[PDB]
Write an enzyme that holds these catalytic residues in place. Structure first.
Site, PDB file in Angstrom:
ATOM      1  N   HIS D  69      86.747  39.738 -26.718  1.00 31.60           N
ATOM      2  CA  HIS D  69      87.104  40.786 -25.722  1.00 31.60           C
ATOM      3  C   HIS D  69      87.518  40.195 -24.343  1.00 31.60           C
ATOM      4  O   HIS D  69      88.102  40.900 -23.516  1.00 31.60           O
ATOM      5  CB  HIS D  69      86.044  41.900 -25.600  1.00 31.60           C
ATOM      6  CG  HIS D  69      84.823  41.555 -24.809  1.00 31.60           C
ATOM      7  ND1 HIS D  69      83.662  41.155 -25.426  1.00 31.60           N
ATOM      8  CD2 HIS D  69      84.596  41.656 -23.483  1.00 31.60           C
ATOM      9  CE1 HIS D  69      82.777  40.974 -24.455  1.00 31.60           C
ATOM     10  NE2 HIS D  69      83.305  41.236 -23.268  1.00 31.60           N
ATOM     11  N   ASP D  93      83.545  39.761 -32.455  1.00 28.46           N
ATOM     12  CA  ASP D  93      83.939  39.615 -31.062  1.00 28.46           C
ATOM     13  C   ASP D  93      83.706  38.140 -30.659  1.00 28.46           C
ATOM     14  O   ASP D  93      83.129  37.844 -29.613  1.00 28.46           O
ATOM     15  CB  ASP D  93      83.130  40.608 -30.196  1.00 28.46           C
ATOM     16  CG  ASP D  93      83.540  40.689 -28.769  1.00 28.46           C
ATOM     17  OD1 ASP D  93      84.752  40.581 -28.504  1.00 28.46           O
ATOM     18  OD2 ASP D  93      82.638  40.901 -27.902  1.00 28.46           O
ATOM     19  N   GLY D 149      80.920  39.708 -16.394  1.00 34.02           N
ATOM     20  CA  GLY D 149      81.573  38.409 -16.297  1.00 34.02           C
ATOM     21  C   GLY D 149      80.737  37.282 -16.877  1.00 34.02           C
ATOM     22  O   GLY D 149      81.026  36.098 -16.620  1.00 34.02           O
ATOM     23  N   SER D 151      79.689  37.549 -20.414  1.00 34.59           N
ATOM     24  CA  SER D 151      79.887  37.471 -21.871  1.00 34.59           C
ATOM     25  C   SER D 151      80.386  36.039 -22.201  1.00 34.59           C
ATOM     26  O   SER D 151      81.046  35.395 -21.372  1.00 34.59           O
ATOM     27  CB  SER D 151      80.885  38.521 -22.358  1.00 34.59           C
ATOM     28  OG  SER D 151      82.140  38.341 -21.722  1.00 34.59           O
TER      29      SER D 151
HETATM   30  C1  LIG Z   1      79.138  50.423 -21.501  1.00 36.21           C
HETATM   31  C2  LIG Z   1      78.213  49.268 -21.134  1.00 36.21           C
HETATM   32  C3  LIG Z   1      78.820  47.854 -21.331  1.00 36.21           C
HETATM   33  C4  LIG Z   1      79.977  47.528 -20.377  1.00 36.21           C
HETATM   34  C5  LIG Z   1      79.621  47.326 -18.894  1.00 36.21           C
HETATM   35  C6  LIG Z   1      80.694  47.935 -18.002  1.00 36.21           C
HETATM   36  C7  LIG Z   1      79.337  45.874 -18.489  1.00 36.21           C
HETATM   37  C8  LIG Z   1      78.051  45.211 -19.023  1.00 36.21           C
HETATM   38  C9  LIG Z   1      78.026  43.778 -18.513  1.00 36.21           C
HETATM   39  C10 LIG Z   1      78.256  42.679 -19.202  1.00 36.21           C
HETATM   40  C11 LIG Z   1      78.576  42.597 -20.664  1.00 36.21           C
HETATM   41  C12 LIG Z   1      78.513  41.264 -21.344  1.00 36.21           C
HETATM   42  C13 LIG Z   1      79.858  41.881 -21.095  1.00 36.21           C
HETATM   43  C14 LIG Z   1      80.746  41.189 -20.048  1.00 36.21           C
HETATM   44  O1  LIG Z   1      80.248  40.623 -19.074  1.00 36.21           O
HETATM   45  N1  LIG Z   1      82.109  41.168 -20.252  1.00 36.21           N
HETATM   46  S1  LIG Z   1      83.136  40.512 -19.205  1.00 36.21           S
HETATM   47  O2  LIG Z   1      82.896  39.098 -19.146  1.00 36.21           O
HETATM   48  O3  LIG Z   1      83.074  41.277 -17.988  1.00 36.21           O
HETATM   49  C15 LIG Z   1      84.786  40.759 -19.904  1.00 36.21           C
HETATM   50  C16 LIG Z   1      85.166  42.207 -20.030  1.00 36.21           C
HETATM   51  C17 LIG Z   1      85.438  39.748 -20.819  1.00 36.21           C
HETATM   52  C18 LIG Z   1      85.856  39.829 -19.373  1.00 36.21           C
HETATM   53  N2  LIG Z   1      80.551  42.498 -22.217  1.00 36.21           N
HETATM   54  C19 LIG Z   1      81.134  43.707 -22.194  1.00 36.21           C
HETATM   55  O4  LIG Z   1      81.477  44.275 -21.164  1.00 36.21           O
HETATM   56  C20 LIG Z   1      81.241  44.406 -23.549  1.00 36.21           C
HETATM   57  C21 LIG Z   1      82.711  44.548 -23.985  1.00 36.21           C
HETATM   58  C22 LIG Z   1      82.724  45.868 -24.742  1.00 36.21           C
HETATM   59  O5  LIG Z   1      82.055  45.721 -26.028  1.00 36.21           O
HETATM   60  C23 LIG Z   1      82.705  45.131 -27.061  1.00 36.21           C
HETATM   61  N3  LIG Z   1      84.010  44.913 -27.006  1.00 36.21           N
HETATM   62  C24 LIG Z   1      84.591  44.391 -28.095  1.00 36.21           C
HETATM   63  C25 LIG Z   1      83.923  44.088 -29.242  1.00 36.21           C
HETATM   64  C26 LIG Z   1      82.522  44.310 -29.326  1.00 36.21           C
HETATM   65  C27 LIG Z   1      81.787  44.004 -30.497  1.00 36.21           C
HETATM   66  C28 LIG Z   1      80.440  44.240 -30.555  1.00 36.21           C
HETATM   67  O6  LIG Z   1      79.656  44.051 -31.663  1.00 36.21           O
HETATM   68  C29 LIG Z   1      80.306  43.754 -32.903  1.00 36.21           C
HETATM   69  C30 LIG Z   1      79.789  44.763 -29.447  1.00 36.21           C
HETATM   70  F1  LIG Z   1      78.461  45.014 -29.562  1.00 36.21           F
HETATM   71  C31 LIG Z   1      80.421  45.065 -28.297  1.00 36.21           C
HETATM   72  C32 LIG Z   1      81.833  44.855 -28.197  1.00 36.21           C
HETATM   73  C33 LIG Z   1      81.818  46.749 -23.894  1.00 36.21           C
HETATM   74  N4  LIG Z   1      80.776  45.801 -23.475  1.00 36.21           N
HETATM   75  C34 LIG Z   1      79.550  46.101 -23.001  1.00 36.21           C
HETATM   76  O7  LIG Z   1      78.741  45.234 -22.722  1.00 36.21           O
HETATM   77  C35 LIG Z   1      79.186  47.574 -22.797  1.00 36.21           C
HETATM   78  N5  LIG Z   1      78.080  47.875 -23.684  1.00 36.21           N
HETATM   79  C36 LIG Z   1      78.260  48.122 -24.989  1.00 36.21           C
HETATM   80  O8  LIG Z   1      79.340  48.216 -25.532  1.00 36.21           O
HETATM   81  O9  LIG Z   1      77.061  48.256 -25.590  1.00 36.21           O
HETATM   82  C37 LIG Z   1      76.959  48.552 -27.032  1.00 36.21           C
HETATM   83  C38 LIG Z   1      77.222  50.054 -27.224  1.00 36.21           C
HETATM   84  C39 LIG Z   1      77.773  47.734 -28.025  1.00 36.21           C
HETATM   85  C40 LIG Z   1      75.419  48.189 -27.264  1.00 36.21           C
HETATM   86  F2  LIG Z   1      74.607  48.880 -26.466  1.00 36.21           F
HETATM   87  F3  LIG Z   1      75.082  48.490 -28.514  1.00 36.21           F
HETATM   88  F4  LIG Z   1      75.148  46.897 -27.079  1.00 36.21           F
END
Ligand SMILES: CC[C@@H]1C[C@H](C)CC/C=C\[C@@H]2C[C@@]2(C(=O)NS(=O)(=O)C2(C)CC2)NC(=O)[C@@H]2C[C@@H](Oc3nccc4cc(OC)c(F)cc34)CN2C(=O)[C@H]1NC(=O)OC(C)(C)C(F)(F)F
Ligand SMILES: CC[C@@H]1C[C@H](C)CC/C=C\[C@@H]2C[C@@]2(C(=O)NS(=O)(=O)C2(C)CC2)NC(=O)[C@@H]2C[C@@H](Oc3nccc4cc(OC)c(F)cc34)CN2C(=O)[C@H]1NC(=O)OC(C)(C)C(F)(F)F
Ligand SMILES: CC[C@@H]1C[C@H](C)CC/C=C\[C@@H]2C[C@@]2(C(=O)NS(=O)(=O)C2(C)CC2)NC(=O)[C@@H]2C[C@@H](Oc3nccc4cc(OC)c(F)cc34)CN2C(=O)[C@H]1NC(=O)OC(C)(C)C(F)(F)F
Ligand SMILES: CC[C@@H]1C[C@H](C)CC/C=C\[C@@H]2C[C@@]2(C(=O)NS(=O)(=O)C2(C)CC2)NC(=O)[C@@H]2C[C@@H](Oc3nccc4cc(OC)c(F)cc34)CN2C(=O)[C@H]1NC(=O)OC(C)(C)C(F)(F)F
Ligand SMILES: [Zn+2]
Ligand SMILES: [Zn+2]
Ligand SMILES: [Zn+2]
Ligand SMILES: [Zn+2]
Lengths: 193, 193, 193, 193
Positions: D69, D93, D149, D151
């Site tokens: 992602h 992912d 930021g 992940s």
């Molecule tokens: C809605 C709450 C979450 C988003 C928030 C706005 C941010 C939370 C903070 C950090 C998260 C680790 C952080 C971050 O840092 N990312 S980052 O570095 O900024 C980025 C975008 C690459 C540049 N990751 C996210 O934001 C992720 C991204 C999005 O989920 C996913 N997308 C794609 C595939 C996934 C596959 C999965 O399993 C097979 C999966 F469980 C989630 C997937 C979405 N995502 C999430 O973490 C979201 N939570 C979430 O999706 O949780 C569920 C429903 C999967 C849970 F509760 F079961 F874990």
């Protein structure tokens, strides 16, 4: 009202298509009322029956499609009991159930070919020239008995992909010259009606 | 960062759902930057796009709902210029704007039905068996590409009422077996993130 | 298989059309079995029934005309026993028996009018604008239930002459918008099939 | 689409973790286009960036792992030009490139410890109680901004061994209460999507 029963199948995998019976008259009677059918399901096209009618059903993309004028709103018998309809549209004359475990789904056609082949309940695979979205003219006109009982059957492209579901025949004095079908693009886009 | 633009719609009034394109890539790029859209709006399901992503938006109770992972905090292009969001919740992944004038709203389901139908950006209407409050399983599993770009789209009941908003797919082997959705009861009850 | 039974009729003689029941579900079953019906016959349109279906039959030029999809190859119950069909055409979906004694026959239309009226089993006499030889659009679209059980019924011109026999309805989402009929000029010119 | 670029790293060698920036917005933009990065690589956790997003990447067993992602199907900038992915799974992912020369790989955990430590892009090393194969709860819940930021970052056991790759946060009311992660045993066993 009872369940639709699989009483046979049309095998399309070899050099020559063939129809095979799996159930007679006696077997089909209690299977219809219980909705439990332990028989192993194989192939693309099933030969199906209710208490008063015999017709076909075709597996495409994990869905076993047929005509409403054959199956009505009926369930279909399976090992795990009677299965309800995924799709139901009387205006389109279409019904669909989740394809039975062991069935082989046909893949939808994207070829755009006008060279079609209709599969009958007697395993005949006859050329049909596409004349529109839902119409096709038979290369060779046929008596009604040749096509009767084959609604719910497929129309295939030269590459064996599903193009449509046989619905009705264009007839003149006991002779069919063309066929009316539900095109594959009109299957999964179907609304409940 | 520009607005979300309506680039088409899903027509649900007939026996066959169909996708309509109302804007090409040039007009979408343009309308996204200015936020001014003079196009006649019709129906319940809109095809929507930002400068880089395309997904769905659904009108329920005079609000056009969609996913945060698609729309972000963006305004929506409208006849009177950019329109700001009335609901924004990153945790729920939900956003909503006042529904465009001429749009038709779906009525929330009061059936209690567990036979659901997910509407895709390709006008496919696929059966889903409600499993949890926010989960449903596909009766016939599908490749990812079939469900991709359909977030923000509706889960309908047999009577065509809204049951939820498609959020994510439960994927294994490059295949979606089940769906995750925001239920209708969880829409107007949303707080600001 | 038993006989077709007259179970009632549609009186078109006065300022307001009306349906009258002359037989019930039990009497219909017994008359179907014997083929002997000594009940008095009157009028143009008869309410007819088999063991399972109910539809209409219209007397035109001393022949009681109806649909094959309703009557099949069945004889009609009469005071002198079962009456065999004089016209049988599966392709046209047309059957005919010598009109029963007491019946009034309609006269074929020679007016050339495109302003038609369809007579339903509930005695509604509704406008239909002619489109082709065998088609007409409903001035008010109708739910399927409004037209179902009325095949074999007549299409009239404004002067009350026979224009055709109602065969099928052009339906969308449970609503008929147009009708398909067997024109009067296609009745006596019919061949066996 | 350009290359994923190392824009910094997390140093875990002292008594206090620290983040060091090695490239600014201009350098990341230029290095992304060429795919050539002459910079020295050190440590286990890299701060990585595309033209739009920033996240983490962790070296385990000579592979620099991150989230699909964040990276997508993108190459990573290196001294010998763009390096392609050896691991690509949309369903999990997960992505992985051959670790850069100079990187230090973490070793997979075999403690069976349920006391984990998540490493953030701000060099915070926060306790996480393992609950399942792919889940952990935070000992002290956090605002979303604290984890965003991160992940691609590691979950470490008390001994500093790799337990998993941070994927998603379990959020309620702008607060993360738990974490979702890809376990180390699920890294090399990954098939292409
Ligand atoms: C809605 C709450 C979450 C988003 C928030 C706005 C941010 C939370 C903070 C950090 C998260 C680790 C952080 C971050 O840092 N990312 S980052 O570095 O900024 C980025 C975008 C690459 C540049 N990751 C996210 O934001 C992720 C991204 C999005 O989920 C996913 N997308 C794609 C595939 C996934 C596959 C999965 O399993 C097979 C999966 F469980 C989630 C997937 C979405 N995502 C999430 O973490 C979201 N939570 C979430 O999706 O949780 C569920 C429903 C999967 C849970 F509760 F079961 F874990
Ligand atoms: C009158 C000539 C035809 C009937 C013949 C007696 C039979 C022809 C042989 C095979 C046909 C495929 C075969 C068969 O096999 N059926 S079966 O398996 O035996 C059965 C009864 C379930 C057990 N289908 C028929 O017999 C069908 C049944 C009947 O039509 C229909 N009924 C209901 C709804 C329909 C909706 C439609 O569009 C939305 C529609 F086009 C037709 C509808 C009627 N039907 C037909 O095929 C008829 N053709 C027909 O109606 O054609 C028209 C007028 C629709 C045409 F020319 F435009 F196509
Ligand atoms: C990895 C498998 C899935 C991604 C596939 C590549 C695509 C599946 C196809 C369609 C999905 C509806 C579809 C689509 O169409 N999107 S789209 O229109 O294309 C887009 C990007 C806007 C332009 N949605 C996705 O791809 C989503 C996007 C991403 O998940 C999420 N991101 C942010 C917040 C979320 C919050 C959640 O709960 C609070 C949550 F459950 C998921 C969140 C990721 N996402 C998903 O659907 C992913 N599934 C997923 O994350 O599933 C879990 C882990 C949440 C599950 F299994 F529990 F449901
Ligand atoms: C799919 C929508 C229609 C079925 C609905 C469920 C009912 C519509 C209501 C009234 C229709 C006059 C009403 C009724 O009343 N019947 S009834 O009295 O109830 C009955 C069953 C005897 C006891 N007729 C029907 O339902 C008919 C029956 C069936 O079509 C047909 N079957 C057999 C042969 C036919 C031959 C034809 O041409 C040579 C033909 F055009 C249609 C044939 C099927 N049928 C129809 O009217 C169907 N419409 C239809 O087939 O229309 C087409 C495709 C021929 C159209 F649109 F081109 F006209
Ligand atoms: Zn093909
Ligand atoms: Zn409902
Ligand atoms: Zn006249
Ligand atoms: Zn360890």
């Amino acid at each position: 009202k009872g369940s639709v029963v699989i009483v046979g199948r049309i095998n399309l995998s070899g050099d020559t298509a063939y129809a095979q019976q799996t159930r007679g008259e006696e077997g089909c009677q209690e299977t219809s009322q219980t909705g439990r059918d332990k028989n192993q399901v194989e192939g693309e096209v099933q030969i199906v029956s209710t208490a008063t009618q015999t017709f076909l059903a075709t597996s495409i993309n994990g869905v076993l499609w047929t005509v409403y004028h054959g199956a009505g709103t009926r369930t279909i018998a399976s090992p795990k009991g009677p299965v309800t309809q995924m799709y139901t549209n009387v205006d389109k004359d279409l019904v669909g159930w989740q394809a039975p475990q062991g069935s082989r789904s046909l893949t939808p056609c994207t070829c755009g070919s006008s060279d079609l082949y209709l599969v009958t309940r007697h395993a005949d695979v006859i050329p049909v020239r596409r004349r529109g979205d839902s119409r096709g003219s038979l290369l060779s006109p046929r008596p009604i008995s040749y096509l009767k009982g084959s609604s719910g059957g497929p129309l295939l492209c030269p590459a064996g992909h599903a193009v449509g579901i046989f619905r009705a025949a264009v007839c003149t004095r006991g002779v069919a010259k063309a066929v009316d079908f539900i095109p594959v693009e009109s299957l999964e886009t179907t609304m409940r009606s």
